[PDB]
Amino acid sequence: KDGSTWKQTFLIDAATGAINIGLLDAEGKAPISFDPVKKIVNVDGSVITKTINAANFVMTNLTGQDNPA
């Protein structure tokens, strides 16, 4: 409850197993997003894990002026 309105914090859709986590940005960009339809896990920010196993560490220039490395 923010004043007279309510801001979404987290959503869990029935049709799609999408779980957005976090207060929405002014432009509507959720911090953490999911999509089983595309089989992607989308996290804006950082990820900390003891280890990671994968088959393709494909660095990307996600931002306009980023430096993948």
Place this chain on the structure above:
Amino acid sequence: TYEVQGAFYDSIIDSELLNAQIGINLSDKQTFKMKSAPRITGARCESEPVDVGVGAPIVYIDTTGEADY
């Protein structure tokens, strides 16, 4: 290209006499080539399309100069 010839003129040598170059006993001439300023032949910019993310802008510009740096 220019040719260089000169020498020292003492207190005896006068401005008019120096212009006449009679008693100066100047040095033998020497010819050298004067370099050329840089110029840009063409201006362009291309970048690679990317599946995910954004292609990093790059500038390709072709010169024709001869400056050391």
